[PDB]
Curated annotation (Swiss-Prot), chains A, B, C, D:
Protein's gene: RNASE3
Organism: Homo sapiens (Human)
Site feature: May be involved in LPS-binding: Y34
One record GO biological process: chemotaxis
Feature type site, description May be involved in LPS- and LTA-binding: W36
Residues that, per the record, bind substrate: K39, N40, Q41, N42, T43
Disulfide-bond pairs as recorded: C24-C84, C38-C97, C56-C112, C63-C72
EC primary class: hydrolase
Family: Belongs to the pancreatic ribonuclease family.
Protein name: Eosinophil cationic protein
Included range, full protein: 28 to 160 of 160
Main subcellular location: secreted
Amino acid sequence: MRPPQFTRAQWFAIQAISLNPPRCTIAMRAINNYRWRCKNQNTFLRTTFANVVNVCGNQSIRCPHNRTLNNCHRSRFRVPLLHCDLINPGAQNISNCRYADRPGRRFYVVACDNRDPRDSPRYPVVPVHLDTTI
Amino acid sequence: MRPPQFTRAQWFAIQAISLNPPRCTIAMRAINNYRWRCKNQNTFLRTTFANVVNVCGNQSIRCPHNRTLNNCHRSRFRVPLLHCDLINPGAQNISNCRYADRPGRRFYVVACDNRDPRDSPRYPVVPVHLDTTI
Amino acid sequence: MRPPQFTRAQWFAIQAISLNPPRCTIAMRAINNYRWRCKNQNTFLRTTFANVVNVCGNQSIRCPHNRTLNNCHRSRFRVPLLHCDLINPGAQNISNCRYADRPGRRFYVVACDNRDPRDSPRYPVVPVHLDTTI
Amino acid sequence: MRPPQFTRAQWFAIQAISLNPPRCTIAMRAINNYRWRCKNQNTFLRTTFANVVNVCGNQSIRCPHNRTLNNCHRSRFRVPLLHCDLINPGAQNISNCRYADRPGRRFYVVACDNRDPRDSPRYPVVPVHLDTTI
Ligand SMILES: [Fe+3]
Ligand SMILES: [Fe+3]
Ligand SMILES: [Fe+3]
């Protein structure tokens, strides 16, 4: 599970949003610091939380990686991103996780839901998971 | 973390040892049933627990995926295996995880340690993690 | 924490239903094996799952320990129980959880909900948590 | 459960050191925000981290709640504290944990260990868990 101190949207933001991420091995430390083991893959969308919230407002579509769900939302434009792949998945802790970098520019698909009570009142509907990029 | 009901060696055996695994999408259900989210990658060694315990008994070498550790052990022979890769990493639960199959035959490297009190007394030293395959 | 391989009803039964429990220090081992740390308190209702499902048919009331919920149900009568209190809550693991036995006879209040798809199809409504005892 | 971003000493201080805590129902929110479920009990020692580090210099004793450990230390004197007891342990989440306040003055016993690499280098030995109070 996610760290209990974070809402789904807050944990989404920590993992999936970074406007100018450093190289993956550095950028991933901010995520893995909250974990017991290294995340095997992660995509940083180079955008803002507010921008993703706006994408939550368009037409509801099927989630490509969760095909029983239809609370997903696709961006109208391709966005710059940085994908990170764990090179040493046998790592037993987070002291030494190494990542390969794959920059790109793709549409993204997010699942959105009603906010958590701990979420800011500014956005009643928020992204809760990055489903995929296209 | 691992499920607390299992020792490191017991959880290793559930993930890493299967003599005749079915296709990955089926085989992985046995692992993911104990998890909240799908495992992103997994290698089934087509061998027995006792055989891996014997490999724990050879010369201690550096762990390729944990280079500050030197409690790893490499098999003397290549062993048949099945590697499973998660095709839909955006899956939000374990109901629908889909895997790609990659059979192979490789040396394996395991980290071994003294057993847990809950582990069987038969093996005082046991494999606790699959570090990598070669 | 509930192990994901169990439904809420299955986990409820494991923690809260035992017709003839042994001493608490023995009885609690089965529950604590699913945990990283000793459970601080646990009440074993000396009853059957069928008895509790019957109570789910009683008048719904507000849950005393979850006041925003109204799917709770109080037993019409007191039932025999074994309450277990953790003697050494400073324990850092589950190697030696020690409990004081407090046998008794009290009313119980359970929350009841529609069955999980994994639950038996023959009980459409099942107990999912022990709210309190009186 | 201790969030991995904290050392044992840091997590000890968060749970067990508060010089002037507010009412328990307020004071416990900071601890329960790191948790999925309400903590059943918690003792706030009204002291300073420097005071507790001094106690680590006292005569080592067997840990009362961890009898296989001998790195515990008892305070020479009673110290002011606030003990908090969970009123509604049937609570299913941390939305409304309610606590009873039990102010007091007791001896405390802490386990002390060598610092984590992430801990300040200026205290070579630090408290890592509150074993019990007397
Ligand atoms: Fe993992
Ligand atoms: Fe606990
Ligand atoms: Fe708990």
